[PDB]
Each structure stands twice: as C-alpha cells, then as structure tokens.
C-alpha cells in the first residue's frame, strides 16, 4: 500500500535502432530490407561465424590444461600483448623502447570508459572534470555518453560530415580543432568513420597531425573495425602507426568485435602509448585500480581465442583470410550500389559510396527522402541517412538503389 | 624531451594480498604454507574446475546453433530467470506476481556497481549522491570502494566483528543502525560473511530484519558463495528469501565466480525485487543505460555455462553434487583444525572455526600472533586474522594447528 521507492521512477527511452528494427519486425510487407542492423550480415542476411573462431574453440574446449582462475586485472598477459602489437606493428621500435602497456577491456566500449575515467583524474592536472571533449559530428552515438558519464560537462562537437557533396569536411574541422582550449583530449576514429565511412587521407592525416601536435592534443584512438574495414591490417592502422613514429601518445581502445564477430564476448583492449617505460608501468598501475572497481578482473573466452588466433601463424593467416571475406562483400556492395545508382542516372554524385570505407556509410538522404524509403518502400535506416552495407544482398541491391532512386527524384 | 603527461602519475600501491602470495613465492622454506589465496584450492593445493562446468563446456562447443551476436544489454535472458529463481526459489510466489528482473552483470562487482551507480541518481530523491552507506567493520575490502567511486563521500560502519569471543556482535551493530540517517542503503552478507563467515542466526535476521522494516532501511545483499557456503541453497539464500515474504525489496547482488568456479569467466547478476511490475520494468529500462556507458553488453560464455546448468535437471543434480564437494571439503578442515586446537589445549575457546560458515574465516589473532605465524612459521596470512579455509590440508593441519598454538601462547 504505502510509496514505492521504485515508483517515480522515469522510464527510459527506445533508442534509435531498438525501435526501428522492432517495425521491421512487424512490418508484414515481403519486399521489406533492414539496413539498420548493427552488426554484419552475410547476403543470406545471416550472422557469420568466423571459421578460424569456431576452429580455436575446439582448441580450447579440448585443453584440458586451462582453468577458471582470475586473471591479471589488467587482463590476459598474451592478449594484450598480441592485441597493441596488432595496431602498432611488431617491427614498431616503439615496442623494443618499452613505451606501451595494454589493458584488457569489455570491447571498445570497455576501452572508452576506462581511458575516460582515468583522463578524469590524472589529466590535466588531478581529478579535472572540466577539460572540454573532441566529438566528432556526427559520431558513434555514445562517445557523447561514455564521456559524459566519466565526467566532462561540455562536449564539443567538430563539424566532419559535409552534407553537400558528401564527403570528409577537413579545415571544417581541422579549424574548430584551433579554436578549442587547446591541450583537451580528442577521440579520433582510427579508420572506418562511424557513422559515415568517409576516413582522412594519408596526407590529410598529416595536416591533422602536426597542426594538432604543433599545439596541446592528446589523441584517443578508437580502432574497432581494424582489417575489418579494407580487408587488412597494414593500412588500416595507419592512423596509428604514423602517430607513434613522430612521437606522440595517447590512448587507443580496440575492438575485436566486428573483426573477430565476437561481439557476445565482448573482447577489447586500450593501448597506452608513452615516453619511456617511466610512467606507463605508472599509468597500468592505477588502471587497474579503475578496473577493480568496474569489473574486478575481465573475461577470458573471448580474449583467448583472440590471443591463440593472433599469436599462432597457420590461424592468424587463416583469420585475415576471414576478414577479408567480410571486407570484399561489404566493398563489393558498394561497388554494385554507386554503379546501380549511376545506371539510373540519379541525379547527384555517388562517388562517396566507394570512397566510403567500412560497414556503415552516409548515402547524402535527408530525413525526409529516408522518410520515403521507410514508410513506402519499407527499406528501414536511419534518419541520418545512414546504411548498414553488409544488409545490402544481391536480391535486395537492385530494389533498394531503385528505391534510392525514387526518393531523390521525387522528393527533394 | 619536453613533459610527459604521463610523468607526475602516482604509482598507485600493492593491495593486501598482492603483496602476501607474492612473499610467499619468494620464500624458500619448505614448510611454508599460503593461506591467503583469493580463491578455493584443493587438498594437493590446486584449483578445481567443476566436471558439470567441463561438461557443459563440451556441449557448447559442439551446438554448432549458437552464435557470437549481441545479447541484450540486461544480459541472457535465460540466465537472469534462472539466477534469480536460484536466490529466491521457484515456488517463490514473488516470481508468480512480476516483482523482479535480473541483470546480468560482470560477477559479483559488476553487479554492485551497477545497482550502486542506479542509487545515486534514483534513490533518495534524485541524483542523491549524500546518502549514508552501509559499510560492515571489517567488510569485503571494495564494498567501500565500489559505492565511493559510485559518488557517495561518506561510508558507515556498522561494527560487525567482536574481537574477544570471536564472534556476532548482534545490538552492537543493531543499535547503531538506529543511529543512522534512516532510509539509507544497506550492502548486506546473504550468507558467508567475508572477511569472518560468521552469519546471523535466523531468529537474529528476523531481528535485523523487523527492526529495520519498521524505519527506513533498503537491503543491497551480497550473495556471493549461495551454495558453496554450506553446501546448499535452501539455507544459503533463506535470509533473502525471507525478505522477500514480509514484503521488502533490495537489489540482490549473485556471484557465480565461487560457486560454479567460472572466477574468469565474471558471471554475475543483480536481482531487483519490487512492490508490483509497475516500476521493475521501469528499473530494468534505466539499468540497460547505466550499463551501456560501463560495457555495452554482458559476455556469454559463462552466463550460457550457469543457464545451461540451472535450466536443466540432471546438470543441476551433477552441479550441486560438485558444490557440496566443495563444500564439505572446509566444513571438514574447519571441524579438524578446531579439534587440533582443542587437543593442544591452545588458550582460549575455538568453536568459532566450526560456527562460521564459508571459504574465509576469523581465527581471532591479532596482527602480533600473526605476525609470529608468517615470520617464524612461514604460514601467510592477512594481520586481521583472516584464513583462507581451503588453504588447509591434511598435510599441513597438523603443522598450523601446532603454529597457531605457539603464536596464542608465546605471544599475547
């Protein structure tokens, strides 16, 4: 009878695509696609699993060797190692000079959050919660938050979609990075632009590079499609690698879940980069003491299978073998798509749809041609325009740039 | 050249046990004896894994149905009916009416911490980050430290061991929970009390319980060795299951690290009883976004291990086999030092050894009779006295035993 503390309490809020993939659900229209799934989907429109991740299962399922015990708070010793060694490349001689340390996390989200909550207390002098924040707009939707609850009340958003011509925004941006209270942190995609696909060029890089070393930033990487957005992994660590070879340092978050498709595993790693061995074995130090209080120690499946992948020769070839099964369909669809859309003679320009990298890509659609392709032709995405390409099919591509083709031409 | 923000980091510094276990290591005296490690060890002082857990390992690795996509961010559904149901029973008529979700979180920590950072925003008004907390004297050494970096800036201890005697101190701690700012929060020990295994007797729950009901108290268990306490989950989970009758509510934090031995596995779940659905839907809905700022969603592997066993009728036969080995293993090595201890005619009484239930336990020494016990003896342990239980075998028994002799009569 009497209150309830739980009573006046406020509902949360259906999220973007929660919502939007529950009216797919229901949506009993046969020609319908889903382009707004979040993970990668085969042509049958079906999960994959990696056959080199089923492969080290069985490894694992049958030594009999392993135990349950805890692990280093920081994490599998090997993962950490073969993951940072992974982004920053084993002839790296930031890796002979003892610079980096890594630390296991819960995905790229783990990764994030600990690198966030440590920069809230030992960057920028001590417990510093009002050093302003680099968000890219627009970016994954919750570098915002993972930031916001570590701390940090301002967000700055740089302008990096250029709506127009569709494509990369460079001193759009790389100016509002002058204005800003320099010596503030910046989150930068490694590569594969959530959500646009559109990534600086190498040269362009270097521009964003100095212009920002010259002058107070501290980057904070944040590699999650690494080989899983070219189909390798020598370029798409670029990013990085050119970083640590001027001399830099900063945080790097990996994931391993869309290039390992262990996304219920939930497998990341925050690389470190430093000065000299000094004060990383410091920065390692009180990371832990982060964790501890988080989760006390991480999961080890998801890393295992990851560590006993990248470490051996004959399952690291067969892996980036995988990974670029993932890679050619995705490019692939892209090709098929921006050609599709030229053959029709759509009025505009689509080259960004193959210069785009990665899984997700921003077609240039304005909510209110999107608003056509959802409510008419039953082609579910987001409002930003934004596509998943892998729920791009050979059966559905010529519906949907058909579809494209119509909302462009008949609303503007 | 220049700076390191890295530089000027304060090394943060080796815990309690850290540095015990690593001494040990070091030592080089045969007859030296670790009773400071942080898990269970068998008699030939290894670690065991469960044969229900090694079986269940082998049927998922070979269902060739499962994949590695998403769970939802609350976790495996089954895996939180199936935990809760554990804690709370099935013939629970609590269940019948919808009073709880689960969420499933990252073992025992995760779950604290997510109930944790939930209170300080929706409990006791809003975004209340000055509510007292409930902090038993000793406690688990990061039940403060997971509701201080939640936000709370005050921690209360309730004095809970009395050191002559060696046993409850029942209105010691009932009186000062009077005292408090009424309508606070309070972290109690489902059963196994760590760091002293002493547990209320029912009667005295009841009064804990009532006298608490009757003014302003919210429960936050911490049910941690459900099972692998006394070798059993009908008395293991009564002190919650009891709450729950007289009509309370509470957030039950699971451990399923110590009771399934899947410690690196991080499995855990957080169970939120209510008045009516209404607002545990609502709970739930605003726990999914707390915790996809801290992981985005919980990993599977050891949740399916613990599902699949509770869910089906000859693993939960097996497993609970496994549990009361464990089990009956200290009960034993309690019974047996207590007696090594009475059959010396040690000063003092001992029935406390065989009274507290659980892995760890109180001995009553006092850091100088420790003291003596790690320097001259060689028998690592923490200065509070506290003993890892299952660190005791039928080979060094005999030599504690005549150890913690000498330390209780040589030194006072």
């Given at each position: 009878?009497?209150?309830?503390?739980?009573?006046?309490?406020?509902?949360?809020?259906?999220?973007?695509?929660?919502?939007?993939?529950?009216?797919?659900?229901?949506?009993?229209?046969?020609?319908?696609?889903?382009?707004?799934?979040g993970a990668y989907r085969?042509?049958?429109?079906?999960p994959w699993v990696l056959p080199v991740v089923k492969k080290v299962e069985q490894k694992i399922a049958?030594?009999?060797?392993?135990?349950?015990?805890?692990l280093?708070?920081?994490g599998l010793?090997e993962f950490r190692?073969c993951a940072?060694?992974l982004a920053?490349?084993?002839?790296?001689?930031?890796?002979?000079?003892?610079?980096?340390?890594?630390?296991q996390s819960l995905g790229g989200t783990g990764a994030?959050?600990?690198?966030?909550?440590?920069?809230?207390?030992?960057?920028?002098?001590?417990?510093?919660?009002?050093?302003?924040?680099?968000?890219?707009?627009?970016?994954?939707?919750?570098?915002?938050?993972?930031?916001?609850?570590?701390?940090?009340?301002?967000?700055?958003?740089?302008?990096?979609?250029?709506?127009?011509?569709?494509?990369?925004?460079?001193?759009?941006?790389?100016?509002?990075?002058?204005?800003?209270?320099?010596?503030?942190?910046?989150?930068?995609?490694?590569?594969?632009?959530?959500?646009?696909?559109?990534?600086?060029?190498?040269?362009?890089?270097?521009?964003?590079?100095?212009?920002?070393?010259?002058?107070?930033?501290?980057?904070?990487?944040?590699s999650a499609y690494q080989g899983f957005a070219?189909?390798?992994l020598?370029?798409?660590?670029?990013?990085?690698?050119?970083?640590?070879?001027?001399?830099?340092?900063?945080?790097?978050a990996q994931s391993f879940s869309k290039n390992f498709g262990l996304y219920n595993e939930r497998v990341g790693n925050?690389?470190?980069?430093?000065?000299?061995?000094?004060?990383?074995?410091?920065?390692?130090?009180?990371?832990?003491?982060?964790?501890?209080?988080?989760?006390?120690?991480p999961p080890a499946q998801g890393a295992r299978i990851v560590a006993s992948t990248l470490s051996n020769?004959?399952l690291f070839?067969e892996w980036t073998?995988n990974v670029?099964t993932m890679?050619?369909?995705?490019?692939?669809?892209?090709?098929?798509?921006?050609?599709?859309?030229?053959?029709?003679?759509?009025?505009?320009?689509?080259?960004?749809?193959?210069?785009?990298?990665?899984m997700?890509?921003?077609?240039?659609?304005?909510?209110?041609?999107?608003?056509?392709?959802?409510?008419?032709?039953?082609?579910?995405?987001?409002?930003?325009?934004?596509?998943?390409?892998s729920?791009?099919?050979?059966?559905?591509?010529?519906?949907?740039?058909?579809?494209?083709?119509?909302?462009?031409?008949?609303?503007?």
């Open positions: 009878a009497p209150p309830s503390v739980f009573a006046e309490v406020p509902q949360a809020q259906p999220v973007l695509v929660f919502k939007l993939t529950a009216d797919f659900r229901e949506d009993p229209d046969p020609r319908k696609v889903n382009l707004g799934v085969t042509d049958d429109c079906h049958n030594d009999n060797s392993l135990n349950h015990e805890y280093p708070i920081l010793a190692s940072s060694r920053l490349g084993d002839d790296s001689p930031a890796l002979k000079e003892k610079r980096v340390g890594g630390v994030l959050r600990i690198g966030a909550d440590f920069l809230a207390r030992w960057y920028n002098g001590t417990n510093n919660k009002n050093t302003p924040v680099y968000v890219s707009s627009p970016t994954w939707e919750n570098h915002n938050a993972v930031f916001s609850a570590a701390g940090f009340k301002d967000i700055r958003s740089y302008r990096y979609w250029d709506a127009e011509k569709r494509g990369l925004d460079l001193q759009g941006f790389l100016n509002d990075l002058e204005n800003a209270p320099e010596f503030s942190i910046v989150v930068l995609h490694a590569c594969a632009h959530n959500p646009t696909g559109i990534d600086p060029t190498p040269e362009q890089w270097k521009q964003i590079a100095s212009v920002m070393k010259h002058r107070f930033l501290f980057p904070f990487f944040d070219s189909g390798n020598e370029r798409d660590a670029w990013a990085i690698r050119y970083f640590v070879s001027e001399g830099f340092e900063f945080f790097c925050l690389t470190v980069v430093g000065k000299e061995p000094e004060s990383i074995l410091q920065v390692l130090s009180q990371m832990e003491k982060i964790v501890r209080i988080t989760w006390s120690n020769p004959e070839e073998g670029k890679a050619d369909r995705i490019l692939t669809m892209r090709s098929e798509l921006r050609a599709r859309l030229e053959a029709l003679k759509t009025p505009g320009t689509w080259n960004h749809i193959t210069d785009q990298i990665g997700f890509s921003f077609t240039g659609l304005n909510p209110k041609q999107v608003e056509y392709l959802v409510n008419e032709k039953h082609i579910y995405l987001l409002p930003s325009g934004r596509i998943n390409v729920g791009l099919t050979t059966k559905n591509l010529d519906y949907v740039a058909t579809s494209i083709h119509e909302a462009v031409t008949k609303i503007q």
